[PDB]
């Protein structure tokens, strides 16, 4: 099951700037494909490569595209000068050779986010909120609360922690983030999570709770000359133990 | 003018150089190029996109670019295991063919080193009896292992052909059902023995193909004559010449639908 | 583009039928996709026909191949919660060797049938600082909307589904927040 | 396999001396179809030739049509030169004002 692979993950590129990002198709795979897609929208095709030849590229791609896959394996796809509109999902799909109606095996891509200024980047603050005592003795289930605000960019993966391990039973985030000023190009934004668990269990101290919120930020290579700590990419987590009152 | 033929000629000479080139065709009549350069249908007429919308024949001009390539490479991997087969040349003869009232006729035909490897009958590759062993496991690969390109063959062929063929000819009726006339002429030389005497009977810029050039000695036909072939001129017209040779005493006729029964009688003094 | 496909969301309850329409513009031999992309993952096949009349079936979705209406429509019978995604129709051309071409995607929610509401709202105060707190509203039925603010210092979350698998229990919740001291969970959401 | 070109040779129309026509060079029935080809006067190359795309028969041998403008005078000599892996050396079929070349 090692599938499509895409690095990096996500990027923060100042407006200007060149970015390379690159494939590794699932081993063979000779149908090599590389699309763009925005939140809202389907993929949309940017080029093909058939081995190493790249027998089709989208009329309307910008001569500031360009991809390569020199050995008929992996692929590399680099924006010169990017702009705000360069902003979006890159995505890279394989396909076998020589099968018709293929599948086309998709990577997770790689989140290239656009900015005017990288000192305008923040990681979030992080807070858990504890149960209701009234949700307790009315319900006997306790909604804890876990609100990440203030972050630049908006991409985020919150996650839950009880004892120890990740959680998805219980468990409900945001679709999307918020913007904390809705009327701004450059608002922060906030993303909130729930966590429901019996009352009996939050209620004995012995259990750990935690939220924690990946952030997609800086790279080590970025310049940094604010006193604040570079906001690269980082975990940032707030925890909570049960209490009987 | 009743059949489409997409041909390709594929020539293998290094494990490092090989070549894909193609063209479509109404008999003699080329109607398509490929620009091999941009991967690209070239149309040599303006009718040569028949009732097709662009949008149709842009998705097949990729069809053709990656099959090109894919079947360039995929033959290259098979063939660089052994160096020693090199050079060869693979042909390929596709299209279709109408007839009032029939099912139209569709073909897929392979050649090996100028002779018949393979077939597409029905929805089996069928090896040629002429290509031995090589044949047999080539259709085994196509028919066991290609079964996507096998329905790919089968539709093109049996849908797509006789469609776009249709159309073909209904946009390029007056050009392909026209009618030009022969110039005629006679010329003598000395021949190299016998006689001592050759007439030349020539017509050339006729069309369409069928053409009656005899020599006659009054209203009878004069049989013992050399007849030429039908050579193409560049403008898709036609040459032909015929030859009597006499030891030089005391008519060459020529009949072409174009003079509406109305033959040239050149006399010779 | 080829591929039309229904505008969403579409919103529907478990057990529900649920009915996405595609349509596309294609020649020859192409062949027909439904991808789904579940919340915070990647693209994925969730069904294909490669040929024509051919149905494409995978866990209660089925989608058939039809040329003479030009339609893809993704059907499932009884919709479960977890189906609740992205789903994008396509098209193969190059007489099913070409790139997927995709439709803009139709997103569906599959809201969980509560029969038991509980609806009320609740204060959770900060497990570090016990000033700063946050609004619960939870146990509504699923046909309740959630009022956005109206106020540019309070923050209120869409409705979200949170399922106790262990409890076979599923419920509904919306968030507020506020800087505001004098903050008041009442209000946040209108009764 | 291997075929050895035939060659024809022949004007487009009757040849008049000082009246410009076209020379008209057929080579047929070669495989394979890596081949050289050029028209000559006085036995030097034309520069300016011109050729229909490769096609073949029905016994897969190819074929082509290569062909220029040129003015016949009295004394002026035309040919058509051909090379191929089964010719050893290039062969040269004239031009006959009257018969063309290679016959058939
Ligand atoms: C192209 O034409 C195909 C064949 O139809 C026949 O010939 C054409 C030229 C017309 O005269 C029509 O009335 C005849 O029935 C059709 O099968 C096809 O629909 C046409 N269009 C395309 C895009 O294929
Ligand atoms: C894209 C067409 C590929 C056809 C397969 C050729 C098989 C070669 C075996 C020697
Ligand atoms: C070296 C043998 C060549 C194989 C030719 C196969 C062509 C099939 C195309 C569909």
Redesign the interface.
Known sequence: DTGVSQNPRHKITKRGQNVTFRCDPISEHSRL?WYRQTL??????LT?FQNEAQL?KSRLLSDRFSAERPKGSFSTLEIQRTEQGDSAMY?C?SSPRMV?????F????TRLTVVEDLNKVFPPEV??????E??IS??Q?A???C?ATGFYPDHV?LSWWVNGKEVH???????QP?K??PALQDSRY?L?S?????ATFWQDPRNHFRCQVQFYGLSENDEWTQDRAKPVTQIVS???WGRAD | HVSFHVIQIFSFVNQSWARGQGSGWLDELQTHGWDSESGTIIFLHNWSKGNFSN??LS??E??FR?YLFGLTREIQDHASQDYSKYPFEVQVKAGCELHSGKSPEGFFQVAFNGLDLLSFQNTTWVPSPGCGSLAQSVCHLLNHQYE?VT??VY??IR??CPRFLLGLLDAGKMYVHRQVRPEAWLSSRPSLGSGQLLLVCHASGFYPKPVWVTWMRNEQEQLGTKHGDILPNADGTWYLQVILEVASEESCRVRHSSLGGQDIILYWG | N??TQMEGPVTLSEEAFLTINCTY?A???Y?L?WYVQY??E????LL????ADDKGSNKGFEATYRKETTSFHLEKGSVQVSDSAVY?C?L??????????????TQVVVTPDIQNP?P?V????????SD???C?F??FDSQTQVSQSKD?DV?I??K????????DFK?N?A?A?SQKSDFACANAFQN
């Open positions: 494909y809202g929208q389907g993929p949309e095709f093909y089709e995505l799909a018709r109606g293929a599948e086309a998709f990577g997770q891509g807070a858990v909120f504890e149960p209701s009234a949700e009315h319900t289930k909604t804890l609360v609100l993966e039973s219980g468990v409900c985030t945001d679709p918020l904390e000023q906030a909130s729930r966590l429901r668990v019996s707030a925890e909570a | 949008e149709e998705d097949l990729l069809l990656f996507g329905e790919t539709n093109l849908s797509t | 080829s591929v513009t020649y020859g031999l062949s996709f919340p915070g990647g693209l994925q096949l294909k026909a490669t040929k994008f396509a193969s051309g190059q007489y099913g060797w070409g790139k997927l071409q995709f439709g803009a995607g509980d009320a609740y204060q959770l105060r900060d497990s570090k600082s700063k707190s946050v619960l939870t146990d540019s923050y979350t869409d979200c589904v949170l399922d106790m698998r262990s409890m419920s919740s968030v927040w």
